[PDB]
Structures are given as C-alpha cells and as structure tokens.
Design a protein around this nucleic acid. Structure first.
Ligand SMILES: [Mg+2]
Ligand SMILES: [Mg+2]
Ligand SMILES: [Mg+2]
Ligand SMILES: [Mg+2]
Ligand SMILES: [Zn+2]
Ligand SMILES: [Zn+2]
Lengths: 49, 36, 91, 65, 137, 100, 205
RNA sequence: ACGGAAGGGCACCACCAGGAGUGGAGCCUGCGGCUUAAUUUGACCAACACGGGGAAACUCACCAGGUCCAGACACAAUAAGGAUUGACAGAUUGAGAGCUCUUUCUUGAUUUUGUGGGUGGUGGUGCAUGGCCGUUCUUAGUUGGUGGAGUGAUUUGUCUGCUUAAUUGCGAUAACGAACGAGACCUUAACCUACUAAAUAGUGGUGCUAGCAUUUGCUGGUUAUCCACUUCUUAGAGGGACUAUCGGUUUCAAGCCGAUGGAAGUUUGAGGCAAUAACAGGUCUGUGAUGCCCUUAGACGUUCUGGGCCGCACGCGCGCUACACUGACGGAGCCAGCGAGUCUAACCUUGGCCGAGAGGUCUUGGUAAUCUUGUGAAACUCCGUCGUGCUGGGGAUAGAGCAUUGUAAUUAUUGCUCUUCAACGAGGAAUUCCUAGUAAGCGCAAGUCAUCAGCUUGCGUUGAUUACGUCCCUGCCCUUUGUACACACC
C-alpha cells in the first residue's frame, strides 16, 4: 500500500496546506510559496527593499 | 468478492501463545495453522 | 557470444552497479523443439543475464504485453529496450 | 482493545493530537495506528463527546460534557 | 600612520612609518604589482611628488577584496593618502597642503575614494537596468 | 568564580540592545571584568518568491527579509552573579545562551 | 542551528496564531504573545473577553494548554498559557473582523454590520476605519462595498507603524464573503514607537 | 471615450546618437500543430525558462491494468452457541497480492446487507465567489463637508501663467477649509583618523622562531605566546546634505543654470510601500477558502505496477554555444561579493591516501564573523604553440568504456575518457533592452534539488560607445475642441 517516498516532491509537503508543489524548503520552513506569502509576517519575514 | 462461506457449526503446534484453539487445517502436509 | 565468452564481472558499469524465477519453471515444463510459454512481466528495468536466454517474455510497455524471445545478443540490455512504449508517429 | 486504548488515552489525558498521516503506523503517544486514532475520534465526533479542529493537518480533539 | 584606499570593494591598508624608502604592496616591491600595464598607476603617487624624495618613510600595503584593477587603484590611493597623512601628522601642514595640491590637481582618485558602487539588480532582467527580451506574438 | 559567555540572538534590535546594556550595567555595578559586547553581524535571511499564486502576469518577484542580529558578552562572575544575570534578562524576543 | 531555530520559532508562532484563530473565534481572540523563559514558555492569549478561554475555573485554558503541549511536543509543565483582556479592544482589527463575521453569519444586513464596526472603531479612539465587504452581496454579481470613517494612510512605513488589517472569509449559503477591516490608531496615543506622522511638525513658542 | 484636431508637458516597456544584440546556424526550453493508449492541464502589451512547471518512481492531475474504504453517524435483518476479520501452500496475477479460486483454519459484535445521511475529489464552473496577483497606470491622479453655478445629469473647489519628477509649488481665484495619492516615510549603498566594543575581525611591539642578508634589516611562523590599539572589519548610538556658499537668470516668486567646497549636489544612487475607480485579466491545479453542479465502492476518493507528460512532416517565443588572431589551446600569474550548511544524522566538507579523470576511501572542522572559505570564481594578465585554411574556430550527431545519485538511469539523469567533428564564413523582412559602475562580457552563491541548468533570484569582477534632446514613430498626463461613439473607433 506504499512505495518509497524518501526523496523528491512526494517526500515532503507544505506544513500548512499539504501541497507538494511550490514548496519553500529554505531554513526548513517547508511551507508552500503561497502559504508563506499568506503568513510571512507571522513568521517574521518582512519587506524592506 | 470475498464471501466468507458461513463455516457452519463445528491439534497443537509450536508458538505456545496459541491457547488450545489453533486446530490446524488438513488438506495435505498442512502443518500451518490459521494464526500463522 | 559475450565479451570474451555470476556473469556480471565482465559487464559494463551500469549492470554491475545494479548488483522471475518462474522463467525456468516455464522453460522445462514444456516439450522441447519449441519455444517456452511466454512469461509476462512489468519489470522493464530488468537486465537480461545469460540465464534467461532462449525464453519468451511478454514485456509490459504500459499496455498490450509485447512478445519477445531472448537471444544471445540481448545480454547486458534492459528488458524495456525491446518493448516500445509509444507508437511511431509517421511524419 | 483496538478502540479501548484510544478511549483510555482520550479520557485519562483529556485531549488528543493526531497528525493527518493516514499511513503512519505508530501514533506518537497512543500505541495504535494513526488511522485508527483518526477514525475512532471521527466516530467520537458530533455523534457525541468530542470537538475537533484541524489547524494545519493535526486534528486537535477535545472532550465535552 | 595607517591609511586605506578603496575603489569598488578592494581595500588596501597602508602603513607609513619611519624608515628608509621601502615600498611594499603585498610583501613584494612596488615593481611587482603585476597588472604589467597598470604598474605606472601605482608609481603615479610617487613620480608626482618626488621621484626618490624619501630616505625617511617606509610604506607597506596590504590589499584584499576587489579585482586586479580595483586593487591597483586601491593601493595607489592608499599610499598617497598615507603619505599625505604622514606629512600632516609629523612633518608639517605646509608640506602636506603643497603635495596635496599636486595629487588633487592630477587627481585620478588618489585622495578621494570613488563613490561608484554596483547598483542592485532588479527582477525581470539580468543587470540593474537591462531587461529580458520582450516579445508580442 | 567562573568564565562565562552570554550569547544573545534576536530580530528585535531594541530588545537586544536593551538586554546587552542591562548585562553591561549589571557587570559594571559589581566591577567585574568583561570583554565588551561583540556584535555578530546581521544574518539577513532573504527569501525571494513570486507574488502571484499562479503563473499569470508580469513576472514580479518579492523578497522578504528576517534580520538576525547577534551579541556575545563574556566575563567572570561567581555562581550567584551567573544565576542572577541569567535570571535578570528575560526580555521577550531575545534568545540567551550562557556557556561556561 | 540559530537561523533555522529563529525561523522555526516564527513558524511555531504562526501555528499557534492560526490554531487560536480557529479555536477561539467565538472568544474574541486577538493575538498570541510568546515569551520563552528559561524555566518555561508562556503563551498569552489576548482576547476581548477572557472568561470563555478560561472556561470552568480554568478548564478551557487547561485543555488548550494540554493540546498545545501534546501537539508541539513539550514537556508537562514546560509550556503554560495565560489570557489577557485586550485594552481598548475596539482598536483590534482581528477582533472587529471576527465580530463582523459573526454578525454576518448569524444573519444581519451587510451595511448594518459594516457601519456598526466602523462606528465602534471610530468611537474607540481610532483616527480612521475602513470595512470592505467583497463577494455576492446580492444575487450573482459579487460586488464590493466600502465603508470608511475618518482618515486612512496607504503608502509608507506608517502603514506598518499604525495600521491594523484583518481579512476573514464568511460562509453563507451563496459563496464566500471577504471581510477586510483596516483600523488606523491615533499615533498620539501610541505608547510605543513614533508618536506622530512623519510629515507632522509641532512647533512651540 | 475617441479623433489621420489644436495647444502644453512627458517616457529608451518611444524615437533620436549609439551599444549589445534577437530574427539566420546547432542545441536547450516553453507554446501551437501532428501523433499517441495517454502524449494531463491552465494561460494566447497584460500567454509562449510562466504556473516558482529543471516531471525516471512520487509530484500526477493523462493512459493500460490491480487493491483498499480512510462509506462518520441514525434505523432494520444478518447476529449475541458466530455479523464479520485475516490467512501460509498452490491455480490466477507484473506482483512474495489470499484480488478471486483449490481450502479449512483463525479472529470476534470492532463490521456486513438495505435506507437515509455523510466524507473525499488537481472533477466542472475564475462568466457564481473569497483571498492573492497582474494590468489599466510609472503615470499624477482621486474624493467628500459647507458655500457658489446649473430645472438636471453635472460643475467649481481640483485653475490662466510660470515651475516641479509630481494636483510639486509660486501664485491666481466662487470658493473656503480638508482627506487620500506625490512627497514625507522605511530598507539598503556611499563617508565618519568622531564615541562604545571586539583569539568568532584585524593591526602593530615584544616573546618563541625556519630562511635571506649579518649593524640588525626583509618576508615569512608561532589558533591559549606576550602587551597595546581600533586605521581596515563588524554594528549599536549618532553626525553628515539642507541643492550649502558664491555668481547669473529669473514677470514680484516658486525655481533653474554654472563654479567652488564637499564622500555625497539626478528626488545623492537603488529599491520597499504605494490612492480612487475598474477588468467578466489569471488563479476552483496553493489552501481543511468556497457556493452550485457532477461523482462517491467496476469511484472522478485513495493506493500499487507499468507507461506518458520528453513522443516529430512543421511554425513561433525566451535562451545557451559559436562563426574566431581584440582568438583557440597550453603552461604560469592567482583578485571578489551576495550566501548556505547535519543532533535524530548524514548537511557544507578542509586534510591525508588511491585513481588519468569522474570519483573512491580514512579522518577532520563547523549548528557557523569560528569550519567548508581568503569559496586561490571566470572573464582577465604574462609567456609560448597555432597562422588564417571550416583551421589547432565550432562542438551538434553518434560509438565504445569508467563512475556517481537513486528501489529503479532503457527513451542515453548527470559526470568522466577516447573516438566521429554536422550546421554555422556575423544572419532577409522585421524586432528587443539599455544613459554610468550603467550597457556588454565574466563567473559565483541561493531557489527548485536524491541526481539533473542552457532557468530565475541576487552577488560581485572587467567595464565602453553614445545622449544630456525631442514629440517624428509607439504610447501617457492636463487643457481646449468636434462627435451621429457609451459594447465607448476593435
Ligand atoms: Mg512614497
Ligand atoms: Mg472636477
Ligand atoms: Mg511540459
Ligand atoms: Mg473603423
Ligand atoms: Zn502551502
Ligand atoms: Zn500460533
């Protein structure tokens, strides 16, 4: 009922929406690129320049 | 489509966890019980 | 023949980096002087070694299992190399 | 026992947190299948005694009166 | 006594001390700067004021951080600033002003660091202002 | 007395500097020896992403920034001063690590 | 590491904020303050009314603490919750958005709710409020209505300094309604940071 | 609103003067078409290296097949001496799959069968929606209160003139006083021998100390070996520019033009933020955002195997590599900056060793201003070989072998070695971007990432020519004007 999912896009998902595409893995966020835009201010990422 | 024929109203081996309810099925040389 | 002549120590890099038992039970369970009954498989990534020679394998290319007889010159090649996965386009 | 462990944990502890992984063999705290936990508290949903919230695929369940 | 020179990112720190006319750039003599074509850019802050002019000062530079040409300009500014600073601190303000006159009258950023810095790159095209090729159909 | 080093990390510059000045003041009030607060440079955790949640429009990119400033302050103090200095700086937002 | 650690702390704050937004919506939740202390980590739930978050002599706050600890893998006792009544809760954009969403959900005219929240915000010291209700406000064309009182700035750093915005999705029988609440607090009663607009000059004789 | 209408201003998504080119070649990549079992799909200035879309499996949504319910909960009939669950061995099946069968064991009210009623759906509808983003629109524009003008839609305020990047101001004035946008603001890049403070940054004077030279110098070493300092570096608090001063020009002024001084005189350079109205712009394939419709046990849920998304008469867009001597190739010289990196663990890897290379192996440092790393980058520079010929330019196509990542490289993942050495001799009509540390050339780090850059986001290295204008082309803003336009000249 399962085949290996230790790497590639199927190994990891967005921690918020569980989407496998558009994931941001920098610094270990593991948050979709859209969910990160939605809740970036909460994490502490701001726009300065 | 597993039907589980009713199996209407009704030995011993290793792995002593079997509590006298492990009667083997005898088709031919079938030393293997329902549990294992 | 092969490169001079298991039989993997005299083989290219991929096949040695990688390193159906019913094939023999389909080989001998039939009269001689004809080809063995086909053995069907999905494993296109299986390498042909000099033990399945002379057998008949139905390789899955996604549908409509393709019938291939194993020849001595197929050694070192993948089973999928002989079951084309698409249709020629005729352009 | 399959649901007895789940009910015992639910009562003794008071709440439950279950990650939304329907193939994780071992729940973090309860020694049962994660799917078993999720389906047990789904049975224990508004039919009675449990309120569930999702909050990033984690299934917070809490007991009611 | 301690001065520095920059062009884009290369900083050259020069130490000007009491000695006898020793001009080192990276441990090697100033004859060894090795652009092999801008070696006169590093001689320029010497030949302007006084060819020898010096049995009294020793200049020892150390440059890092830019490129070959930027380092050449950085050290050529650093040793000029070091000479000016040494003359201001130790010898006299009159001489300091008098050779600052020659340096600034021939100025090729000998005393003033160039303020040109790499402008940040913007999205939608490589480079700060160059944009990706646009098509319509 | 023991050698200690306090490492302070934060995104809030005002909180970080307030805590660092509190530590410096508590050291000078007892006249201890300390190597001044060294400012480990801001790590700008830049993250570039695409503004649109789809693939339509002018390709507008958007950079978010997370500034991590660090300070370190090492001194000598007995166990009492060490415990009171780790228990005097609980400003919200500054992470404090004390090493011997 | 430390970069990853701070990023994960922000992610944990976002997790807590959305969890409490979903759970304590009926409680007038406004925002968490996370304060990591060497002995324990304390999360303070800022709510307009902080009696339902406590529940029956701490039952609700205790179960919320237990849920948070069990989810974020804390040690029993290591994490503790609190609850604070928000001072001048008419200036909380999240609270006002939640209240207007509750009114629209239980059944009330869009104009009536938007003007109610606008009046409440303006009378609680605010120098400006704007409520935008987008969606199928009527049958099928999904227009957007704006309701504004007072002043409102849009461009610059003072938008981060003193402007509070909140967006909520309202679930009625025909599609979703987007509520946006924008509140500009008075810079004079700031109590932190700059106390006036950058362009404001006050002269004394 | 529009005008092949007029006045004024503007803009390298316009031009002029030019640079680099693109269009021509090979290849990469996306799109269409064709093909297919499927070649999933959205999108047609403001689609086409876009969906962060570099897809072997997964991703996946497509195709050929095979499992499972993860159908809550409520009612009845199967059932409380058995409703149902699982099964090893063979048939069947890619399958070591109890799928189904040959078959008789096993478990135990946890589920089966009808009925509702749920749940899931990358199913449909973006022309039902939220949110977000893009665009109109890079411009300077927008709005009300009271007053004035109109029967009224409306108008004035919000303007002749001058000025500004600016509805920026001087002013003018049936308007007055205001709000938003602009500006102000914030971030960053420039300087500061000023303060604070630094074996996680550095520099000197002594120690210890190899070399060369010996009146004591030069360059080197001394990660717990000594002291002092903060020029370089770092980052806190601040300073600094305000067009300052001086001339000239300014209708009276707002301003403008030069020169000096200045680190910096264009809004100091670059950004971030960014109004009112909108579009049937895109996204239901980001979302446990979602209404409605469809599906829901031979499923359009979900999972497993295999294939496809890449498939090739052709056309198009973004690009990489070139056509060579301002060069290719060999040695030698040996200069960055932005960054990232593993404690449940395999990440960035120094050093030693083996290998021709790719790489392998034994350690090591680093959770990081500490180590990788001074990222000893490339273009570049020096000295040589080549000698202008499809040449030693160019490296497509292909053959053979060696490895690495991965459960799995076949339709070559990629890297390495040898061999084959295509077009291409500077590109038609057309057409793009760009004004100073910019164009262009050059590489580097990050993102996606197990592996895979010809992509993007940033970074630095080398660093031009031309212009300092204009409204001719394409458009934009304001005013006047005409309209038989209002879906607004498509
Ligand atoms: Mg602004
Ligand atoms: Mg008007
Ligand atoms: Mg594709
Ligand atoms: Mg016409
Ligand atoms: Zn996401
Ligand atoms: Zn047994």
């Amino acid at each position: 009922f399962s085949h290996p999912r230790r790497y590639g896009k199927g190994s990891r998902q967005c921690r918020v929406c569980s989407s496998h595409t558009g994931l941001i893995r920098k610094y270990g966020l593991n948050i979709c690129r859209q969910c990160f835009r939605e809740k970036a201010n909460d994490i502490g990422f701001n726009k300065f320049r | 489509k597993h039907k589980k024929v009713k199996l209407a109203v009704l030995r011993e081996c290793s792995n002593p966890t079997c509590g006298a309810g492990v009667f083997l099925a005898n088709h031919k040389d079938r030393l293997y019980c329902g549990k294992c | 023949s092969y490169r001079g002549v298991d039989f993997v120590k005299l083989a290219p890099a991929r096949v040695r980096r990688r390193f159906m038992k019913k094939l023999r039970a389909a080989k001998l369970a039939a009269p001689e002087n004809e080809k063995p009954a086909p053995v069907r498989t999905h494993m296109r990534n299986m390498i042909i070694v000099p033990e399945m020679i002379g057998s008949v394998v139905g390789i899955y290319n996604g549908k409509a299992f393709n019938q291939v007889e194993i020849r001595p010159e197929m050694l070192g090649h993948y089973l999928g190399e002989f079951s084309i996965t698409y249709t020629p386009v005729r352009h | 026992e399959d649901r007895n462990k789940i009910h015992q944990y639910l009562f003794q502890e008071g709440v439950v947190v279950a990650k939304k992984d329907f193939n994780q063999a071992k729940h973090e705290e309860i020694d049962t299948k994660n799917l078993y936990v999720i389906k047990a508290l789904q049975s224990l949903t508004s039919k009675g005694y449990v309120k569930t919230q999702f909050s990033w695929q984690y299934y917070y369940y809490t007991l009611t009166e | 006594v301690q001065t520095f020179g920059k062009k884009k990112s290369a900083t050259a720190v020069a130490h000007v001390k009491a000695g006898k006319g020793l001009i080192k750039v990276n441990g090697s003599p100033i004859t060894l700067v090795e652009p092999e074509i801008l070696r006169f850019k590093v001689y320029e802050p010497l030949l302007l004021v006084g060819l020898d002019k010096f049995s009294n000062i020793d200049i020892r530079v150390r440059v890092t951080g830019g490129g070959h040409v930027s380092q050449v300009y950085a050290i050529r500014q650093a040793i000029a600033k070091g000479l000016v600073a040494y003359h201001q601190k130790y010898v006299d303000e009159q001489s300091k002003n008098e050779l600052k006159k020659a340096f600034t009258s021939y100025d090729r950023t000998l005393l003033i660091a160039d303020s040109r810095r790499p402008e940040p790159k913007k999205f939608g095209g490589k480079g700060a202002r160059s944009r990706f090729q646009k098509s319509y159909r | 007395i023991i050698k200690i080093r306090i490492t302070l990390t934060s995104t809030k510059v005002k909180q970080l500097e307030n805590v660092s000045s509190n530590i410096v003041k508590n050291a000078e009030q007892h006249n201890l020896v300390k190597k001044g607060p060294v400012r480990l440079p801001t790590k700008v955790l830049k993250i570039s992403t695409r503004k649109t949640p789809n693939g339509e429009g002018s390709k507008t990119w958007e950079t978010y920034e997370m500034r991590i400033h660090k300070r370190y302050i090492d001194l000598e103090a007995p166990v009492q001063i060490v415990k009171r200095i780790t228990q005097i700086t609980i400003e919200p937002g500054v992470d404090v690590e004390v090493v011997v | 590491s430390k970069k990853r650690k701070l990023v994960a702390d922000g992610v944990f704050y976002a997790e807590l904020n959305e969890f409490f937004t979903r759970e304590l919506a009926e409680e007038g939740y406004s925002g968490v303050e996370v304060r990591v202390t060497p002995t324990k980590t304390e999360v303070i739930i800022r709510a307009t009314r902080t009696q339902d978050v406590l529940g029956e002599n701490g039952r609700r706050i205790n179960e919320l603490t237990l849920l948070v600890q069990k989810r974020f893998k804390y040690a029993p006792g290591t994490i503790v919750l609190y609850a604070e009544r928000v001072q001048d809760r008419g200036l909380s954009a999240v609270a006002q958005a939640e209240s207007m969403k509750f009114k629209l959900l239980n059944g009330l005219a869009i104009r009536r709710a938007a003007y109610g929240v606008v009046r409440y915000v303006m009378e609680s010291g605010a120098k400006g409020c704007e409520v935008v209700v987008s969606g199928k406000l009527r049958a099928a064309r999904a227009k957007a209505m704006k309701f504004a009182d007072g002043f409102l700035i849009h461009s610059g750093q003072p938008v981060n300094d003193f402007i509070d915005t909140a967006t909520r999705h309202v679930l009625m029988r025909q599609g979703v309604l987007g509520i946006k609440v924008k509140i500009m607090r008075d810079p004079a009663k700031s109590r932190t940071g700059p106390k006036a607009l950058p362009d404001a000059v006050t002269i004394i004789e």
